[PDB]
């Protein structure tokens, strides 16, 4: 019970008992917390509770020090000092933002705004408090017990009465019972086991509530600027393929950390793999939150870097399928590709963290605690999608509040910016450039003349709260008959339920906007489905239309985003 104050570092025995993380608070700060919040239980070697037998006084403001013990107003001896006096709580070794982080329920956007504008130690307190609140919230939903098994990919469930029913999308991963993780999609439901098993009737599923570990390392280490490239040895013979990034690779070697903003198809993976060809002796650990993002870095590495010095780190509890062409779990190979939660304790000359909009401050801190590096590179785009905030229901989280790195890219600007989109037809580049990049994103491709927009509100139906628009899928069906080249298109929408209906009526491969991020397809068919804050989000809109290499068909619901689309309008 001897720790350091989360607000001023002053050595103390005091920890708040009403805080779910029980942070160490100094005498001066513990006071300004207990007197300003409903938090009155103070902890030390022993709790600050009335020592008198059968007495339930636990409020620190209703307690005193009677010699060496603690008592309330009704049990204190004559020679007793109040615990709360002169702006201090009695302790050994003798706040507005801390109070709000300590007592908030994390359902409001202003909670996440504060969690990112506060001091660095408050960002860590905010990050483990939030994560602990998110885990304890999982204990609230109901158990799904199997009622009947139809086939290898379909079943019927019986839900627990009196406890809510969680959203049945791939975002929510149940743990079967210990018969492996299982995912679900829409009374005939579709079941997806990570481990192949002949689903037993009566066997039950539950949401795994992993333990939240305390955070030690900052989200961002303190910045260092150098006068020359430090600990890295560049090549003079660097292929013309990577010549565009030489000046940026040098910036990478002359700073402790650097930020790269890369709009869709501007060459982020190329920059990341090319950083290894520029510092060919450097050991580089490549990391991201998702397995898909780590796999996208493995694909680009497999093309330019020696396959023998590569290794894809897979956690022992292997959940879903990932990259199979590197030696698995060889921690000491020069190039290590691994997700943030699976990172071993190691050092590196460079750490590359990709898809930075998807990271939380918890992930930012974890990377700094597991990896000790000469240089850190954060690659991503704050105009793309962030990590889902399951508790957040009121308000919209702006990009400068996604994490510390995103806050930096939006306020002081990114250190590096890839300005030429090589993927998209100019119609798409011109739309997103004006929408989210302040007209700074340039088109390498010409206009494809295969980008269409239709304004069709249709009819909105709902599977629980996930939306469907059958008339918008009907409009797509009529379009496909007159445009058979579009037979090879990927159907994208902001809702899983819309995607489930489109898969059966159109037969096209389906993808949510959130699961499409990082991927590219020749043709994309997007139905907006609704006019909600979710389907109108400019980051989601940006990701949705920047997936296409050749053409896109956008069936819009919102007049605003329809009018901004620089596409050929269609009739019906
Ligand atoms: C018909 N749409 C279109 C075409 C070319 C350039 C700009 C637009 S707009 C005004 O909708 O942004
Ligand atoms: Zn507290
Ligand atoms: Zn303090
Ligand atoms: Zn008492």
Curated annotation (Swiss-Prot):
<comment type="subunit">
    <text>Interacts with nsp8 to form the replication-transcription complex (RTC): nsp12, nsp7, two subunits of nsp8, and up to two subunits of nsp13. Interacts with host TBK1; this interaction inhibits TBK1 phosphorylation and decreases by 75% IRF3 phosphorylation, which leads to reduced IFN-beta production.</text>
</comment>
<feature type="domain" description="(+)RNA virus helicase ATP-binding">
    <location>
        <begin position="237"/>
        <end position="418"/>
    </location>
</feature>
<feature type="domain" description="CV ZBD">
    <location>
        <begin position="1"/>
        <end position="105"/>
    </location>
</feature>
<comment type="function">
    <text>Plays a role in viral RNA synthesis. Multi-functional protein with a zinc-binding domain in N-terminus displaying RNA and DNA duplex-unwinding activities with 5' to 3' polarity. Activity of helicase is dependent on magnesium. Binds to host TBK1 and inhibits TBK1 phosphorylation; the interaction with TBK1 decreases IRF3 phosphorylation, which leads to reduced IFN-beta production.</text>
</comment>
<protein>
    <recommendedName>
        <fullName>Helicase nsp13</fullName>
    </recommendedName>
</protein>
<feature type="binding site">
    <location>
        <position position="19"/>
    </location>
    <ligand>
        <name>Zn(2+) 12</name>
    </ligand>
</feature>
<feature type="repeat" description="LRR 8">
    <location>
        <begin position="208"/>
        <end position="228"/>
    </location>
</feature>
<feature type="binding site">
    <location>
        <position position="33"/>
    </location>
    <ligand>
        <name>Zn(2+) 12</name>
    </ligand>
</feature>
<feature type="binding site">
    <location>
        <position position="29"/>
    </location>
    <ligand>
        <name>Zn(2+) 11</name>
    </ligand>
</feature>
<feature type="binding site">
    <location>
        <position position="26"/>
    </location>
    <ligand>
        <name>Zn(2+) 11</name>
    </ligand>
</feature>
<feature type="binding site">
    <location>
        <position position="5"/>
    </location>
    <ligand>
        <name>Zn(2+) 11</name>
    </ligand>
</feature>
<feature type="binding site">
    <location>
        <position position="39"/>
    </location>
    <ligand>
        <name>Zn(2+) 12</name>
    </ligand>
</feature>
<feature type="binding site">
    <location>
        <position position="72"/>
    </location>
    <ligand>
        <name>Zn(2+) 13</name>
    </ligand>
</feature>
<feature type="binding site">
    <location>
        <position position="50"/>
    </location>
    <ligand>
        <name>Zn(2+) 13</name>
    </ligand>
</feature>
<feature type="binding site">
    <location>
        <begin position="262"/>
        <end position="269"/>
    </location>
    <ligand>
        <name>a ribonucleoside 5'-triphosphate</name>
    </ligand>
</feature>
<feature type="binding site">
    <location>
        <position position="16"/>
    </location>
    <ligand>
        <name>Zn(2+) 12</name>
    </ligand>
</feature>
<feature type="domain" description="(+)RNA virus helicase C-terminal">
    <location>
        <begin position="419"/>
        <end position="572"/>
    </location>
</feature>
<feature type="binding site">
    <location>
        <position position="8"/>
    </location>
    <ligand>
        <name>Zn(2+) 11</name>
    </ligand>
</feature>
<feature type="binding site">
    <location>
        <position position="75"/>
    </location>
    <ligand>
        <name>Zn(2+) 13</name>
    </ligand>
</feature>
<feature type="binding site">
    <location>
        <position position="55"/>
    </location>
    <ligand>
        <name>Zn(2+) 13</name>
    </ligand>
</feature>
């Amino acid at each position: 019970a001897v720790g350091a104050c989360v607000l001023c570092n002053s050595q103390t025995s005091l920890r708040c008992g009403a805080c779910i993380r029980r942070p160490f608070l100094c005498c001066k700060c513990c006071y300004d917390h207990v007197i300003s919040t409903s938090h009155k239980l103070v902890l030390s070697v022993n709790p600050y509770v009335c020592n008198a037998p059968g007495c339930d006084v636990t409020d620190v403001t209703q307690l005193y020090l009677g010699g060496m013990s603690y008592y309330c107003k009704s049990h204190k001896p004559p020679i007793s000092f109040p615990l709360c006096a002169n702006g201090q709580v009695f302790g050994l070794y003798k706040v507005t933002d801390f109070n709000a982080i300590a007592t908030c329920d994390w359902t409001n956007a202003g909670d996440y705004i504060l969690a990112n504008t506060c001091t660095e130690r408050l960002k860590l307190f905010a990050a483990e408090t939030l994560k602990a609140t998110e885990e304890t919230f999982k204990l609230s939903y109901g158990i799904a017990t199997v009622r009947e098994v139809l086939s290898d990919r379909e079943l019927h469930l019986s839900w627990e009465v009196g406890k809510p029913r969680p959203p049945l999308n791939r975002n929510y991963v149940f743990t079967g019972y210990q018969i492996g993780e299982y995912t679900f999609e829409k009374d005939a439901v579709v079941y997806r086991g990570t481990t192949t098993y002949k689903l037993n009737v009566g066997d039950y599923f539950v949401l795994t509530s992993h333990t939240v570990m305390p955070l030690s390392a900052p989200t961002l280490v303190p910045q260092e600027h150098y006068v020359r490239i430090t600990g890295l040895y560049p090549t003079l013979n660097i292929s013309d393929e990577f010549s565009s990034n030489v000046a940026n690779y040098q910036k990478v070697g002359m700073q402790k950390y650097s930020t790269l903003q890369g709009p869709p198809g501007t060459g982020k993976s190329h920059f990341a793999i090319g950083l290894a060809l520029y510092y060919p002796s450097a050991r580089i650990v490549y990391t991201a939150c998702s397995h898909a993002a780590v796999d996208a870095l493995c694909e680009k590495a497999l093309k330019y870097l020696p396959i023998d010095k590569c290794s894809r780190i897979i956690p022992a509890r292997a959940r879903v399928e990932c990259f199979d062409k590197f030696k698995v779990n060889s921690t000491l190979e020069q190039y290590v590709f691994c997700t943030v939660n699976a990172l071993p304790e190691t050092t590196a000359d460079i750490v590359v963290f990709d898809e930075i909009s998807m990271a939380t401050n918890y992930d930012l801190s974890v990377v700094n605690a597991r990896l000790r590096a000469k240089h850190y590179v954060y690659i991503g785009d704050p105009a793309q999608l962030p990590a889902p905030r399951t508790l957040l229901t009121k308000g919209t989280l702006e990009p400068e509040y996604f994490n510390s790195v995103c806050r930096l890219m939006k306020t002081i600007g990114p250190d590096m910016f890839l300005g030429t989109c090589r993927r998209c037809p100019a119609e798409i580049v011109d739309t997103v450039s004006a929408l989210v990049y302040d007209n700074k994103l340039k088109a390498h491709k010409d206009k494809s003349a295969q980008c269409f927009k239709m304004f069709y509100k249709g009819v909105i139906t709902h599977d629980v709260s996930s939306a469907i628009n059958r008339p918008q899928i009907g409009v797509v069906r009529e379009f496909l008959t007159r445009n058979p080249a579009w037979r090879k298109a990927v159907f994208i929408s902001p809702y899983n339920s819309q995607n489930a209906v489109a898969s059966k009526i159109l037969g096209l491969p389906t993808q949510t906007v959130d699961s499409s991020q990082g991927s590219e397809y020749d043709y994309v068919i997007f139905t907006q489905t609704t006019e909600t804050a979710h389907s109108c989000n400019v980051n989601r809109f940006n990701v949705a239309i920047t997936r296409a290499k050749v053409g896109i068909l956008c069936i819009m619901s919102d007049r605003d985003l329809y009018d901004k689309l620089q596409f050929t309008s269609l009739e019906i």
